[PDB]
Amino acid sequence: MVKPEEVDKAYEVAKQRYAEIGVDTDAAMKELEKVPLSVHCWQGDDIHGFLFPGNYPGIARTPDELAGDMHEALSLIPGKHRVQLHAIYAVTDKKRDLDTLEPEDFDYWIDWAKQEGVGLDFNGTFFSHPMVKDNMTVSSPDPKVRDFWIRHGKISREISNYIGEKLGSQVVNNFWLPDGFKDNPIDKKTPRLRLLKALDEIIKDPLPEKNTIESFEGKLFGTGIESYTTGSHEFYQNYAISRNKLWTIDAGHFHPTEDVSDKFSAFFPFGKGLFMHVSRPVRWDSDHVVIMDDALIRITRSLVRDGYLDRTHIGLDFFDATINRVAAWVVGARATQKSLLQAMLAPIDQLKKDELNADFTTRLIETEELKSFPFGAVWDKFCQDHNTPVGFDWMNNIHQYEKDVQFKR
């Protein structure tokens, strides 16, 4: 086990190293505790939900098991966070379909969130259903298919409004559609006009902003839908800005070499807010667990340096069933927090002045030196201050949870 005295000693020296270069480590930690991460429920049960019943043991099979697993992960993540629901995580003994869901079907999660002390975000479920016709939903050329998914869309807003009212925290309602073509399309225009019309119909009925606002998630390509995506990043950025809604940036859904941290400063002169879905793509939209890599470092430092956190909701989105599913959440959440914290531990005001004076020598030297400053000592202090295990130690908690809970399922 890490000795708390070692943490305190390392922190006192780190505090002085940072103070020497004009950085306040105590202030950086206060800034970090103001950034809630929206932990996605679907990593716990391989996106099965409850509506329509070499993988690691101990998958959650019930609301109680999934709630318990999220409680365990949150207990190992320092600070206070949020949970993202999917529509298929409805808890009810009533026979429901996606077009007949009712807000009270989420009373279970409202009660859980109040007891756990977390806010809730929402996702409509526009996949894994017989009404998905040729990979299309809201923007299907089939009117019956459109109407079914438009009803689910409107219901996602009603559920979100209800949750937001009960919780007293705004529910970000994220729309992701699979709609697209496997092979090269003739008509790229009409599907996007069908999408535009359908989305306008979904958001028409006004709901209190204090309770919910919608975000729209584009994708470049998906398995079986490689050649064309109706809901493109350009379509949704244009839609978000014109309809005054949020734009969802999923770090896994762009071109090879594409840096999503570039988009923030091109959006905020025109738009309202972002839902930043941190996700690790490995050569495709693979939904690997978020790790501390160039992409995460750039996302977190671009939000911190340019002051966009107050208008950017950070959500996790990944699905890895090859490892302990509770551990997956903690790895991704801690990777995101330590990357935000490293960005907050820079003399940003002074680095900005140096850059304004075109002192590119100083900027290169200092940014490179900061990568080996004692940021880990500040992160360890943050973990310890918030009653979470330091470094390797939380593996003990996972091993105990496996023995007592997961391996017994």
Place this chain on the structure above:
Amino acid sequence: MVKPEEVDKAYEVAKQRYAEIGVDTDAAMKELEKVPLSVHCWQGDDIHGFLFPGNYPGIARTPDELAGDMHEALSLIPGKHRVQLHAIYAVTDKKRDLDTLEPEDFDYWIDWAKQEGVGLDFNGTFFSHPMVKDNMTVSSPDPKVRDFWIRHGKISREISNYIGEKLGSQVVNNFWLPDGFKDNPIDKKTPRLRLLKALDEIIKDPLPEKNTIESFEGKLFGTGIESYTTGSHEFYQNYAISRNKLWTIDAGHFHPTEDVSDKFSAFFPFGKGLFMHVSRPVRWDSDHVVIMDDALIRITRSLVRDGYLDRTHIGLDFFDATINRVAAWVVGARATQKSLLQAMLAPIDQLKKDELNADFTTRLIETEELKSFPFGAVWDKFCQDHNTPVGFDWMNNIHQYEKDVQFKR
């Protein structure tokens, strides 16, 4: 030398092959006639211009030489086209800088365009000048630098309005800025806010759309400016939609594997018009001569299939000084025209129906068969009908122009 009667005969056979699948070759050729390509003047003199005085022989060094070279290229490109000027192509014996150019400095090109029977598009020159400070111009942190380039931007609009008034054809005034950083920036927000404020000042003074409209050209990266581009594709699409201006898509300026033909149908539900700069990137923004490849085939078929040509200006943008510079124009122009014509020779209405009906088997079979239909016979007929040489034959014209003009320089 190809025989006119044999071109006519091969056309009659192709006309019947196409008629049998519900395609009218005469109507396809009439559609191609209505698509003017904006031929860039700067390929003729390696972007030297006239304002501020190993490779293929015969570079143009004077207005008369460049005017003559463009006349020769257009004489080998069938139909009616346009020419793009840069501000540095001003023709005047007065001492000028970029912030003191006057509309009359382009009387030479107005007079030439009238005689040649072509319209003119325009480009402000925001590069190769001592006032480019650390690769920044309009969005420089230095107010003196900003104010200089804002004067040039306003002047570009005044010139463009004057040319448009004199020719009775709208001048598309294209803005490209090099502004960015070689290495990783601290502040991505402020440069883009400086750009937004400076562009708004440039376009403030009202001018009639009849004479001129501005287009905004983004870039991912350039040589010596690799890490950050102030004027991003997202920034300019947002800017164009917000300020009711045109958006410039340069085929060479996107990510590896990025398909710019995807963007049109995501723009036109929101925006006014496009300036499509066809350009061949080979692994970077290399500005190779446009050839008939996947990118050009996808750009041209996406414009004709979805009916965007009436709102899309097509310009050439490439620079290859390793080959006959006049030949470079004709290769690129002809590649673009035959690609448009091939797209126009598809049974688009029936293919759209098959696709709406999810007959993806029919769509794959027919689109693949069409690639080996006799589109060549229709292209040859188009060349001959418009008094240009067929196939290899225009090499004789290039060899004669080399002997008589280029090799004597």
Place this chain on the structure above:
Amino acid sequence: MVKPEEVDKAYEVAKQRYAEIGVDTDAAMKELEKVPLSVHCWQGDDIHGFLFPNYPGIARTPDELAGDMHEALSLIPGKHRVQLHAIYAVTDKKRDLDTLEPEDFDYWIDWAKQEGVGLDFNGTFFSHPMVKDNMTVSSPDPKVRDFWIRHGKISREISNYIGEKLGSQVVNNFWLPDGFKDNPIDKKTPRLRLLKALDEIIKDPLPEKNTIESFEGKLFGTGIESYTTGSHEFYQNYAISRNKLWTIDAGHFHPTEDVSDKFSAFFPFGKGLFMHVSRPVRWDSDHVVIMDDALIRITRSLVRDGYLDRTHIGLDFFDATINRVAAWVVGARATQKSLLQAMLAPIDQLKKDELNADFTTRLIETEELKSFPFGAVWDKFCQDHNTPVGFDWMNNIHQYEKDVQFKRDAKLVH
């Protein structure tokens, strides 16, 4: 329907256009006749095989798959080959991958003989309980390695037997899924286990006239994204050092990577290639091959540099969203017309112009050739080999749909 005399007339005009630039269309069509494509059997039944239990009409039995391949080959002009997978064994004896016998392929030998096609082979190193954590031949578990080495050796014995019976060398292609989903600690040891296992598999000598092995690398696959044990570098090195063939699958490389670049860097050192034409759409998606930059460059790089006599061309794709028989024909025809376009260029003169650094002539002529009447030569090739021209083969597909594919699911299996 296109009229034969019209095809004949357009061909005469095309022949003259090409003759005027020093290209012989009759000779180009004779050259294309000599390039057999190895049509992959597994597109017909979604890689199910017969060993282990969306568009209509999937093949469910040997006779159904044989019929579907016959139908596809009847619409592809010229003489071709078929690739088998080990799981396409035909026997009532209970078999595992480590107990297959050469005679289990007598069904396919007899079919190939009467169809007039050669056979290529693929060992099956996937969809089996003995795939342990995505690893087979190069598993750290010696019991798993030993099982897959037994299958490897058997693939060679089967291939040797088929080659003996057909009197045509069987290319026996090895593809392993082996790798990691996430970032590995040890990249060296898996590749040493792979090297040792492959050397054991190829140890027993078999006559080259009957069979030779090819080795197929991959950059990444679904659920194995971060590390592939059998990399392109590993297998190019392995093929050259062990004097075997190297398999290049056009879908298995980096974004923007041009596999047509590899041939001329391999052939100064190596024996031969198995070129697997496949269309990747932003990942290893196994789309049907179409006439695109990649196929045009692969085919023209093989033709221009004279590599066809040392390069086996196979198809590898899997699209079950469309008529599975039509999938084969689209891909085969796209590959043939792309080869034919490359053969219809004044290659000797273009080479001389390039050696003289006349890049102007090279650019103008290569661009003009893209709109020469290559279609008229392709149509003539189709007609001469008793296959429908242009859109016409859709009639054949529609007939096969009514008669076979739209009924098949209701037909008793046997």
Place this chain on the structure above:
Amino acid sequence: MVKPEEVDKAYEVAKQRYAEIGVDTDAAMKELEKVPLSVHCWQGDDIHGFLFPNYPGIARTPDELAGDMHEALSLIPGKHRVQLHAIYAVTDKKRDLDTLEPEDFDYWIDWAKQEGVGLDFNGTFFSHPMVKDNMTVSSPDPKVRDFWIRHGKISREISNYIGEKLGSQVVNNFWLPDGFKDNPIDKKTPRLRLLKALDEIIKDPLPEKNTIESFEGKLFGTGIESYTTGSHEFYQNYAISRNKLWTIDAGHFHPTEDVSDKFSAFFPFGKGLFMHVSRPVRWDSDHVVIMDDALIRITRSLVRDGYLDRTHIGLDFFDATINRVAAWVVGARATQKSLLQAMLAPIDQLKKDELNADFTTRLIETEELKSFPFGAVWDKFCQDHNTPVGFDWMNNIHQYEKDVQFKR
């Protein structure tokens, strides 16, 4: 200025944190000492050289360039090496690339001995009238080919001489620009011309104790985008078959390509690697090396699989927008701290966990190690080797600017 006591206190805590997970920080630092980086001379003078006559203070003479490399090496902890180019010959004699003599490098042999560093070498096959249509050794023109083959042979004679005088093997790296701007018709013949020419260059036997050749491929370059005669495949094949070294330049591969994948596919067949660490930003841009995914993966792949003893690590970048001496130090320190972080992992235990398919433990530990106190071990290494800690070496740069660079 950082207090040595702050470095010592942080180090003692770091040493305990690493010991608790089976990692010896003292041993990790001893391992790092054994990895010399070959510092490229051409960053100091924008690849001008002396044979054929932006931030202030460019080196313009051999003494200025030598002084600048001394200054950079004084701020990089441990013992390293310097890479020369043929155009850095120091002689009063009129030379061309085909008439250089070994003693034209006596200046650099003497400097290397005084400095206490080994020397690697690069033939110069660019920026010369005899570069014809972007081709040199593999030109279709026999006059061009023969000129560049002579330079190739001389590069080996020079390398052998330097190696004999220093008592340290000179890696002689070959990079050719040869290729086409636009799409070629014949891809085969250029590569056969290259094969024959390289075989002629390496024909005359020279002692391996003095020098060995390495061959550097490229995917594409400016004005040569469509085809590169000397491809990565061509040179890996050539190195393995002719028993020479293969040069991997981190800036010269495809978008998303991980050059750290190549080592374990090479070493079952090949002799050795020259690894050129270089940062590409969307093309072969030759940016200063920084601690990024590419550098982290390169360094940890060499450390984890035990390839350092068969892998020469060289720097290759050119950034004239910043202090050129600082450029060397940023790049060298980034490479060293990345090697050190890789050396500070419980590699033997992580390998066992991975063999047992415990991918949960592997993910958790590799992520935790990224925020272990690796910086405290790096600072101790800097201090132990008499170099400034953290931001402090900027004082040295500012003093060197004041006293030397800005006075030029």
